[PDB]
C-alpha cells in the first residue's frame, strides 16, 4: 500500500486585518521527501495574500514554516472575510497505477481589529428556523460561525460555517444543538434552541 500525509500547524488562521503577516508550520509526516505547494483562494475556491515560499522541498519527517503576508488590498471592517490556504504535498491485462497527493486546506479568516471579542462570545446568538424544506441558521455576529457539530431533532447534520451577518441553509423536531469551532480549532461548548 501507499502512505500520504500533510499536517498544517493549525486548523485555521486568524489574520489580523492589515498585519504584516503570520507564520504557520507545515510538516511532512511521510518517509519520503515532497514538494510543498501553497495556494490561497477566495471564499469560492477560485484564483491579496502571498505565501512564502509558494513552493519548496520538505524532507521526510521534517517541518518548516510558511509566511502568509497581506499584500495591500481592501476588506470590509464590519465583518470577517474568508480565504482558504491550501497546502499540497507533492510526492516524488490492464495494469493500473494511481498516484495520490494530499491537498490540505484550512480557513484563513481576515479579522478587522475593529471587531470586539471572539466567536465563542457570540456562538449562542445563532437563531434557527425551517423554510424551503431546509434548516436555516442566522448569524447576527460579525464572525464566521464555523459549526463543528450540529444536531436537529436528534439527527446529525453535516457541518458548515455560517457567514457573518448572514445565513446558511442546511439540507434536511424543533430542537437545534450546535457547537462552533473556536479560533484555536477546538470544539466549543454546546448550545440549544428550538426553531422559530
Amino acid at each position: 500500500s501507499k502512505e500520504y500525509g500533510v499536517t498544517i500547524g493549525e486548523s485555521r488562521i486568524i489574520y489580523p486585518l492589515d498585519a504584516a503577516g503570520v507564520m504557520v508550520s507545515v510538516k511532512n509526516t511521510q518517509d519520503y521527501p515532497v514538494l510543498i505547494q501553497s495556494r490561497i483562494y477566495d471564499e469560492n475556491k477560485e484564483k491579496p495574500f502571498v505565501v512564502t515560499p509558494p513552493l519548496f522541498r520538505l524532507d521526510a519527517k521534517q517541518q518548516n514554516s510558511l509566511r502568509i503576508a497581506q499584500a495591500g488590498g481592501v476588506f470590509p471592517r464590519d465583518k470577517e472575510s474568508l480565504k482558504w490556504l491550501c497546502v499540497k504535498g507533492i510526492p516524488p491485462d490492464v495494469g493500473v497505477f494511481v498516484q495520490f497527493a494530499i491537498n490540505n486546506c484550512i480557513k484563513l479568516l481576515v479579522r478587522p481589529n475593529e471587531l470586539k471579542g471572539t466567536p465563542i462570545q457570540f456562538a449562542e446568538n445563532l437563531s434557527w428556523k425551517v423554510d424551503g424544506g431546509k434548516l436555516i441558521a442566522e448569524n447576527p455576529s460579525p464572525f464566521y460561525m464555523n459549526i463543528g457539530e450540529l444536531t436537529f431533532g436528534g439527527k446529525s447534520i453535516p457541518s458548515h460555517y455560517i457567514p457573518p451577518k448572514s445565513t446558511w441553509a442546511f439540507d434536511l423536531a424543533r430542537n437545534v444543538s450546535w457547537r462552533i469551532i473556536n479560533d484555536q480549532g477546538g470544539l466549543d461548548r454546546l448550545y440549544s434552541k428550538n426553531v422559530t
Partner: protein, 149 residues
C-alpha cells in the same frame, strides 16, 4: 515573615489540521473474452484519516487532469489514449452508500459526516465509453483536497 503576590497563568492549546491517506491496490485487472474490463471491480481502497470528527463528505474532493465530474479517469501509457472511468464511493454508519466529491461532484448519496477517526473509500471501475481496451499500463494522478471545517 510571609509576603504574597498573585497572577494569572495562561496557555493556548491548538488542534492542527492533519490529513493522511492510505491506498491499498486491489487485484490486477484482467480483460474479458470480449475486450471489456468488468464493472464494479475493486480497483483499490482509500483510507482517509487524520481529520477532526465532524469533517464532511462534501468537503473532500478527488480531482484529476481529465476533470470528468463524478469520475476518475485512467489512461493508457502507450500513446493511444485508451481510457476507462472509475468512481469513488463508500459506506456511512447505517451502511448506506456515500461518496466524496470527485472533480467537484458527488456521484451517490447525501452529504454526511465522515466516520470517526478514518473513512474508507473504494475506487470502483465503471467501464469506458470507447470500449475495446488494449492491455497495458493505465494511470491517473489524483489529488485529494480536504477543506477542513
Amino acid at each position: 515573615a510571609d509576603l504574597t503576590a498573585s497572577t494569572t497563568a495562561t496557555a493556548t492549546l491548538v488542534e492542527p489540521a492533519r490529513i493522511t491517506l492510505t491506498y491499498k491496490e486491489g487485484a490486477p485487472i484482467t480483460i474479458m473474452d470480449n475486450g471489456n474490463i468488468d464493472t464494479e471491480l475493486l480497483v483499490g481502497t482509500l483510507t482517509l484519516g487524520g481529520y477532526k470528527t465532524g469533517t464532511t463528505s462534501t468537503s473532500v474532493n478527488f480531482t484529476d487532469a481529465a476533470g470528468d465530474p463524478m469520475y476518475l479517469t485512467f489512461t493508457s501509457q502507450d500513446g493511444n489514449n485508451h481510457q476507462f472511468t472509475t468512481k469513488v464511493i463508500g459506506k456511512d454508519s447505517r451502511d448506506f452508500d456515500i461518496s466524496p466529491k470527485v472533480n467537484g461532484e458527488n456521484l451517490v448519496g447525501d452529504d454526511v459526516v465522515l466516520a470517526t477517526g478514518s473513512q474508507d473509500f473504494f475506487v470502483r471501475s465503471i467501464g469506458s465509453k470507447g470500449g475495446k481496451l488494449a492491455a497495458g499500463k493505465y494511470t491517473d494522478a489524483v489529488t485529494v483536497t480536504v477543506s477542513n471545517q
